[PDB]
Amino acid sequence: QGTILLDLAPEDKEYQSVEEEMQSTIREHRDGGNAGGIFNRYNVIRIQKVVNKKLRERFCHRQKEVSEENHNHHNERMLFHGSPFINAIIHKGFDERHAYIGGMFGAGIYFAENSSKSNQYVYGIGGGTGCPTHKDRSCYICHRQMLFCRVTLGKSFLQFSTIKMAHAPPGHHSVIGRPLAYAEYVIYRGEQAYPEYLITYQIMKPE
């Protein structure tokens, strides 16, 4: 009835692939490192595949609906996600009723093609107050977690603005904020993402 976490072995292609996506999509942030910390590399502690029958059924069911509405293309992408909700997501799935980033009049679940972007939201908006233990947004000690996710984008609506909506526009299934400094991918239904890989990691302190 629950989630099985399967550990990948570091010598497997699949683990190496996930780390490669993670390490290589790091970019400099306009922050100067304030929200996510100062680093140019991660220390990857563990990578786990999340398996949950119920999460998978909801994802696959929505994926078929999107294909039908999108000339038989679900338009799936692998994308990164960071939020303080990681533990609830791997057990309960993504839930849009948490409007982590939007607000009390905002909506949408955010993903990034750049892992360093997702890492800014691991402790909250603007990096919250940092790690629970040390209250350090730039903690090199505490193990952080993020997700590398299957995301059903369907027909994406592209925008280039400091604006954001509370649903996808007519005909569409996701919203892309284009560079902004980096791209952001927004979906408005939780069943449009599956939390494939759970990455446990530290940011590294430069020498």
Amino acid at 57: E
Nearer to Zn ion, 90 or 139 (CB): 139
- Rounded CA-CA distance 101/127 in Å is 12
- What's the min distance (Å) between Cβ of 142 and Zn ion? 3
Q: What share of the chain is helix, strand, coil (3-state, %, to 5)?
A: 25, 25, 50
Is 81 labeled as ligand-binding? Answer: no
Nearer to Zn ion, 38 or 142 (CB): 142
Nearer to Zn ion, 130 or 177 (CB): 130
Structure-block tokens of residue 194: 């599956």
Is 167 labeled as ligand-binding? Answer: no
Closest CA relative to residue 140, chosen from 60, 67, 42: 42
- Rounded CA-CA distance 67/173 in Å is 10
- What's the min distance (Å) between Cβ of 141 and Zn ion? 5
- What's the min distance (Å) between Cβ of 37 and Zn ion? 10
Is 134 labeled as ligand-binding? Answer: yes
> Can you give the binding site for Zn ion, defined by CB under 5 A?
131, 133-134, 139, 141-142
Nearer to Zn ion, 109 or 122 (CB): 122
- Using CA atoms, how far residue 95 sits from 30, 83, 91, in Å, is 29, 12, 11
- What's the min distance (Å) between Cβ of 10 and Zn ion? 24
Specify the 3-state DSSP secondary structure of 93: coil
Is 149 labeled as ligand-binding? Answer: no
Q: How long a stretch of residues is the chain?
A: 207
Q: Name the binding residues for Zn(2+).
A: 131, 134, 139, 142
Q: Name the binding residues.
A: 131, 134, 139, 142
